[PDB]
Amino acid sequence: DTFLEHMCRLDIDSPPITARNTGIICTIGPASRSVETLKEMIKSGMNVARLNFSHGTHEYHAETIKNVRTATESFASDPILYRPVAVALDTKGPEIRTGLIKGSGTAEVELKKGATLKITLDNAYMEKCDENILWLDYKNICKVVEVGSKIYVDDGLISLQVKQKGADFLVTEVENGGSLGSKKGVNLPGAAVDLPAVSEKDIQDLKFGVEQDVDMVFASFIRKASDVHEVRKVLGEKGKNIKIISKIENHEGVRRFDEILEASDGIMVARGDLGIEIPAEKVFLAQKMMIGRCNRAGKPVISATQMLESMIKKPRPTRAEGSDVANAVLDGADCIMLSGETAKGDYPLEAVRMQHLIAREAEAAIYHLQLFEELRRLAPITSDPTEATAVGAVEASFKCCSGAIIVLTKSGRSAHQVARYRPRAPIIAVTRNPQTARQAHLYRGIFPVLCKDPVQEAWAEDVDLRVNFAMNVGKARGFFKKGDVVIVLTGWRPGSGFTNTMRVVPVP
Amino acid sequence: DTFLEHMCRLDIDSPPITARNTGIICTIGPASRSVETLKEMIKSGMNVARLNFSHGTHEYHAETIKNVRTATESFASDPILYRPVAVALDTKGPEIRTGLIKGSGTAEVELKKGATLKITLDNAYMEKCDENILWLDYKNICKVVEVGSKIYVDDGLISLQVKQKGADFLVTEVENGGSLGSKKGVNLPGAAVDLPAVSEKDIQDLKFGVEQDVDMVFASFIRKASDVHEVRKVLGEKGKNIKIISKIENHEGVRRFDEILEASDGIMVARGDLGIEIPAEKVFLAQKMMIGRCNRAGKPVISATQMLESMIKKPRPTRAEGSDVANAVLDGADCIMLSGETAKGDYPLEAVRMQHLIAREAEAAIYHLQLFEELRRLAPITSDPTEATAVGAVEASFKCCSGAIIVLTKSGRSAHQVARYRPRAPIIAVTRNPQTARQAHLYRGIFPVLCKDPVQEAWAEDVDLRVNFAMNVGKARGFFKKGDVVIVLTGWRPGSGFTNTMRVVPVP
Amino acid sequence: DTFLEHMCRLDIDSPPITARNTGIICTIGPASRSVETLKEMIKSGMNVARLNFSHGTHEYHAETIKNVRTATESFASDPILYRPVAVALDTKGPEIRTGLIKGSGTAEVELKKGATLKITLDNAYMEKCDENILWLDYKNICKVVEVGSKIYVDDGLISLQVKQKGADFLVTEVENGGSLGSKKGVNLPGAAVDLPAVSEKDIQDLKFGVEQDVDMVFASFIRKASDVHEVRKVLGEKGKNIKIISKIENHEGVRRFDEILEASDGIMVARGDLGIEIPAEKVFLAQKMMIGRCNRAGKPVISATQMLESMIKKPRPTRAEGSDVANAVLDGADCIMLSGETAKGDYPLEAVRMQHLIAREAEAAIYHLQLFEELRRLAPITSDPTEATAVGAVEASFKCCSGAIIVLTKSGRSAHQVARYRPRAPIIAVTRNPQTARQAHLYRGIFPVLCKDPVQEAWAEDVDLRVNFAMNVGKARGFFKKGDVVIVLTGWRPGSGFTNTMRVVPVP
Amino acid sequence: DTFLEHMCRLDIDSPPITARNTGIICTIGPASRSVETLKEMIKSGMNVARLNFSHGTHEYHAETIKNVRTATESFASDPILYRPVAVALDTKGPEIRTGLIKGSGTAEVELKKGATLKITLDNAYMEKCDENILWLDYKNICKVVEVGSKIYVDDGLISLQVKQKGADFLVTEVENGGSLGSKKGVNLPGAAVDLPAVSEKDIQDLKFGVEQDVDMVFASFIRKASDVHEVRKVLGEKGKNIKIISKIENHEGVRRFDEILEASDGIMVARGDLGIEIPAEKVFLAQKMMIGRCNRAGKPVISATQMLESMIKKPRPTRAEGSDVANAVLDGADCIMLSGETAKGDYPLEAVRMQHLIAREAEAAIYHLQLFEELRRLAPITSDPTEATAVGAVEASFKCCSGAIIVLTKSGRSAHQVARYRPRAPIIAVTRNPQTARQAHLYRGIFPVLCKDPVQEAWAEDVDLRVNFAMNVGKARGFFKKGDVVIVLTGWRPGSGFTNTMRVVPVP
């Protein structure tokens, strides 16, 4: 009825009645590139393998994608239970990274409050940083910094405000402290950055991605719409179909968020990079704002970083990491991302699993019909057949309590359009295009299904075969039973430009 | 918006930007049964022809039907512009009536105020009525009426008050003077009048109605469900498919309205008969209530019995009758009924043309999305395929700003199912079944269209036959043009089931 | 709940539970200037005596106002039951009137379809018009007419389209026909008018009004906001407090309706003058539009002309005059007006009474809380103490089912502001300013009460005395009983610029 | 609007344009009971001081109260800027606790995974606990626990699994390693733990609470209404006026929540205790439900037990705790509670200051008129004077865009009555009664203000005393300025009755 009536009526001992609508992106690192580790991850809800090109070589990310695909297709033998799994390339982007401190890639020299540390960029101490003296990537720091500007190191625990500029060197106080350590990153919040959004390394990484048939790019440190356009002209014609997800990692990208969203296929909210750049008492508005617009606009949005970073080293998360994530789902994020817990973890399965749990359970508190009616209200009058067919399909899904909204697409477009409006019922997307099954996982509520059957002489016949596919899938995965109802969205005629037929059909 | 704003921004100087949705019912009498006259009337907007069986032999009304079918079909050589026309039989009923005035001649005597009238029941004075003895044929008048009771003779114009009750007579003072002719009808407001709702005449008349394939019965002085049931049993299973419209003409009907509606296919508010048997000020609440229940019940209701009464003898009406019909059409009426204006009148055509104009001009003060959003969440929720397909279709018509909702069933039932959500787009109902094209004028917003084609021996090709028909009609008739989007509703097959294919098709 | 649920729930045999909120303006003429006739009219709900300065002298309207006041104060002895009665001056305004036809002020010469009639304005036939030849007021008709323009005579039944222009004379066909008769009016729909909105006669009439302490002016044929401003500069400083009601009697005033409403204190909709000037299939939108804006803006609006014009000569109105009026109340008119039925009538009491009945009964179909919530929603953020106090007072009146909203004002302003928002509960306005008690009757829902008690030394005491007045008034008139609730709106402190105190106080 | 738009148009870069409405509760321990420290905390936002009676003698907490009263009143020489401060007693309850570790010293032993622990009940080992024998003081541990049961020692950090049940002991495998000190508390999730809700200690502690005029009791491990009733009977009629907040810390409480709420003055969600006894993913639904019921019930609810847990030993928090408190305040919390951060922490002040900042920044994602329009038509409708005066006052605050709603009762009850409609303007509650100024921090949006003046011997002058006080406070404290409009609520007199004078006063 009311939103409040709907929170009051929640029952913690009622069962999970929904299957899980929000997607899980896992970051694949040393702890999760074994094929066996990944088979389990896929079995515990992984849907997108993130590769962080901020660290490592090409032969290594290619081994990593080979094991992801080895595990993903161990399931292929029975295409009903087969879960697609997408590969995501997260670019490096305009980073600043520290040296090796002693000559060693595993050291940490422990800075002390009040102490003094000279930044050098003498290209000499590239691997000699100790307690004083410190080397950096950014050649032109001595230009955008000023005598008081604050510099954060590692994800941010080690802080320090400069006292002495230079032209070659720089010297500074230490508010905070801790460990320095090696190959760490540096932030310069509230300080300009003349690094390009696409370095020549990031160009090479993108093109690699095209060669490897990745399904999405996570473009780092996007600040303005030219940065998106560059990523796409690199991906070029060969990767006009790769989805670009801009990462909002600084204040500008929030300020310039609308034009970033125009140019991009979806948005990643990097909550930690933000909670360094802008005061933290405000990230959570930014997130909420940036999710809502991505929902007005029916573009995926990914909530990321500092999710369960206590499952790097405990097998069970703080009850407030739990609440953090479960509220990202409620704000209407499309997907959730794990960085350290699945990459460097001592318990990566435990994290993937807990994430599926938390997120299944947050949908108990989604008021699905308020969402829908708000998102319909806010939709424009279109002359798009496929848009109107989606809206009707969702109305109907609510007046039946549809078990599903079976949607046949090659594009993926038409299953996206239906999910735009947040049906409570799951969208079973039936495709023959393995790229579209992998990319579908971005969009909340799409359960992609990959048909491998050959195309039939008579298209009528063909449609029935795909739809019956989807219905054995639903019966099996548990979404419904004989004699329930579904919406089915198809074309009338082959090579109809659009998905313009809705049938309200009882499960057989 | 508000409703109040939707008025504030009305524009008289603007041109009607909606079709006429309300059906025009016409009472056929001697001024309007020539074939040429009925052809010109059908041209001007007539949708239903009412025969009034209180007057006339079966051989008379059989010829009047003959000419209406003649006229109606003169246009049948161009399906695009053939307009179907329904044939309604209105019953005599439990009427009280006067005897005859004596002599021969201009059969009329003057009833002067404050003077005296013995109502007698002696069948000697049956043909010897005058200003002192007046015979009527209700034999228990004397027991159901009392002293001080009113008696309205000739259709309300004359009032008597009952001064003295006798054994088998009554002495009355004339209170509303007038002039009395022969066989004119009497109203005993407030009396327990006990005549059967179905007389032996009414039985032979309904059995006539079936022999002539009439489409609706307007049944008179209905008081209770048992009355509707007796009419139905009489129509029996040779005429099960005839629509029965109960006429509410007295207080017990308004009282028992609810049970009368459940038992009936539709309602007629008879405001003149009801203006006699009720405090005339209370009438306009009676109608507002009974239109209201009828709309929530999804049952057509007709607003009647005096609409444009000046035009018996004047070509144009007093704007108060125009505000009267306009507010009946806004109140919720599906049909308006013309009675004297088109039966015995001098301008049966300027009457049809004016009513068409007033209904088409009133529809602008109808706030249409208001009506939808409520009727979506008033009328039975959460059910079965057909009602989910219909709602799906209406939310689509609203999203894509459809120019028409093209509906294929043969009963009519699924086109009703849609009209019961008051979409803003006209519902073109395509049927091969002439009765349902005639009968569907009762439902507001439905535009019957009769496909006279043989059936293509393949379901989808038959469907596109009909849809392409509806399209060409709608383009000819002005509803939509090339490039607009229409919604389409159909069978899953000819397996029966129900109607469960919605489609959003651009207009060729 | 819904609007439709609220129409369905109407009961015609439940009692009138409301007292009558809409006001009644009666036109005082030969049949109603006796003091005894008027005492009864006041006793049957008259609230404003309209004097039509279109006919008659000054000594005559002054006799007429003397008898209105004689009857109004026969009730004054017991100020609880005393009903105030306001005098309204309806100007003549830029009229065109015909001659005397034979030399006699009572003749009628009966024009015939197709016939020929010369208009002359030779100032010679001022009183000789017969069947041919016809004299007019308007000197410059031969300028704004053209060879085909249509001229209507009497309220409009006699029509005629010119065939021959001139410089001095004019000659014409006769569509329609009937009686010509004497001192009749002429309309020139769709034809310019160089008559002034304020003739020198209308100046004199206004100033007379000021001398006689009229309470409102009904300004005729207002076309633009300069016309309002002229009426007020005439009324001048001595009549800055006389309320000006513009009459919208032609197409322009509808076109220029907004600026007319700015300049004026309220609007009269003259439905007959309109239904000649603009097609009649559109008056009823104009009316509806013009009432709604007058409600958005909290200015009184009066629905007028052709109300019950069958109670000029029958003691009981057409059931469709009844429906006409009862729908004006529903559209939200503030007041209702009778012209012929109370002026020239053979049954003026019967009309005043039926009007009270019809209008009491229409409020059964007002959804009072939808009104309020729409009118609140549509209100601006004001920093007006008195506006906010009114809105809260009305909310409260709904959360109690207030018997009344007792409002103490001198101005009248604060009782107007409360009524702006259409409480269901009646507004008892307690004033010492007899002008404000008389003018209050314009505003729907104000039941003015005139306190004659002297001002008390202590203002606290004084307020209690006026409020207890109002509560004996309510107890007596029937609005409520001991132990019910009311809202009471007063000032805190004397000579507070405003009514800023709301008390929710139980009737004693 | 939509709710979704209200997010889409959030602006991080904008400055907080609302006051803090949520009360900050602080747990006073050894890091925060000096008088100087409490003065600085009260300055930074503390509204309530919580004593935790699980630890400490009566002479200890009596001195801690002494200093809180000292600090609190240092500011009392300027009413304008004295902030009242409530004193909350939190009970020990049915706690299970460990014995002591042997020796003396740094009383801590290491519990290593996969190793063994005999839980014994022999009061010989009561002070001779170690890594093998661990004594606890719950004597029926053995019958309510089972094999495979978990046992969480020291506040969740340590988990044991029950390998072997004995007669009077248990053998357990250590699953979450750790370090164990003395007298640390045990959780037996899922066990029928039968200790009394009110122990003999808790009785002497509540009787202390009354001797010291505390204002609220936070009562722990409440499971059923009878538990609340036993606490109430103990507080007896010397402390009838003390507010009892039930603490929901186990599953039976969440289960029986509804009865617990009826019996209680308010709720505390204890998310850490609740995160142990429940699947931690289910917690965030539990809270959302229990905040929800509490808001519809118009009963304050506190969100607690881990809010900013980093700041025990770090000056600023992990943004995830910040998103955590922000979403508790949006969920509906009236108060936030700080526990370790301000009791034993190193930065008790940077914690108060940060929480103030996070609550004040979160209130922008609160959609306020949404909350009103529902709470107006959810919460008991159509009644009695006081609730009609309160709603009147809120609709006014919204119309005139009020800067404050200034409320005079002495109990507090009428200021609650208003806060229960969530107005957008802060409620300045003016009382002469210090307890109600302290106690009213529990209610969101209420800003207590204590008038220390004697009573003017004339009701209205007393009223203007207080109102002019509230005005000057509100101007000093920033809420509104000269020329803004405030709403005022008051007695009709000191006759009792209730509160029934609303007033809309401009600001001097």
UniProtKB/Swiss-Prot annotation, chains A, B, C, D:
Modified residues (Phosphothreonine): T18, T172
A GO term, aspect molecular function: transcription coactivator activity
Post-translational modification: ISGylated.
Source organism phylogeny: Eukaryota, Metazoa, Chordata, Craniata, Vertebrata
Positions of beta-D-fructose 1,6-bisphosphate binding: T409, K410, S411, G412, R413, S414, W459, R466, R493, P494, G495, S496, G497, F498
InterPro entries: Pyr_Knase, Pyrv/PenolPyrv_kinase-like_dom, Pyrv_kinase-like_dom_sf, Pyrv_Knase-like_insert_dom_sf, Pyrv_Knase_AS, Pyrv_Knase_brl, Pyrv_Knase_C, Pyrv_Knase_C_sf
The name this protein goes by in its record: Pyruvate kinase PKM
Binding locations of K(+): N52, S54, D90, T91
Cross-link type Glycyl lysine isopeptide (Lys-Gly) (interchain with G-Cter in SUMO2), residue numbers: K92, K243, K247
PROSITE patterns for this protein: PYRUVATE_KINASE
Catalytic EC class: transferase
Residues bearing PTM Phosphoserine: S14, S74, S77, S104
Protein residues bound to Mg(2+): E249, D273
Site (Crucial for phosphotyrosine binding): K410
Cofactors named for this entry: Mg(2+); K(+)
Residue positions where S-nitrosocysteine is found in the record: C400, C401
Main function: Catalyzes the final rate-limiting step of glycolysis by mediating the transfer of a phosphoryl group from phosphoenolpyruvate (PEP) to ADP, generating ATP. The ratio between the highly active tetrameric form and nearly inactive dimeric form determines whether glucose carbons are channeled to biosynthetic processes or used for glycolytic ATP production. The transition between the 2 forms contributes to the control of glycolysis and is important for tumor cell proliferation and survival.
Species for this entry: Homo sapiens (Human)
Positions bearing 4-hydroxyproline: P380, P385
Residues recorded as bearing N6-acetyllysine in the entry: K39, K66, K143, K243, K247, K282, K299, K410, K452
Other facts noted in the record for this chain: There are 4 isozymes of pyruvate kinase in mammals (L, R, M1, M2) encoded by 2 different genes: PKLR and PKM. The L and R isozymes are generated from the PKLR by differential splicing of RNA; the M1 and M2 forms are produced from the PKM gene by differential splicing. L type is major isozyme in the liver, R is found in red cells, M1 is the main form in muscle, heart and brain, and M2 is found in early fetal tissues as well as in most cancer cells.
Binding site for L-serine: N47, R83, H441
Effect of R376E: Impaired homotetramerization, leading to homodimerization and subsequent activation of the protein kinase activity
Cross-link Glycyl lysine isopeptide (Lys-Gly) (interchain with G-Cter in SUMO1): residue positions: K143
EC number: 2.7.1.40, 2.7.11.1, 2.7.10.2
Cellular component annotations (GO), alphabetically ordered: cilium; collagen-containing extracellular matrix; cytoplasm; cytosol; extracellular exosome; extracellular region; extracellular vesicle; ficolin-1-rich granule lumen
Similarity field: Belongs to the pyruvate kinase family.
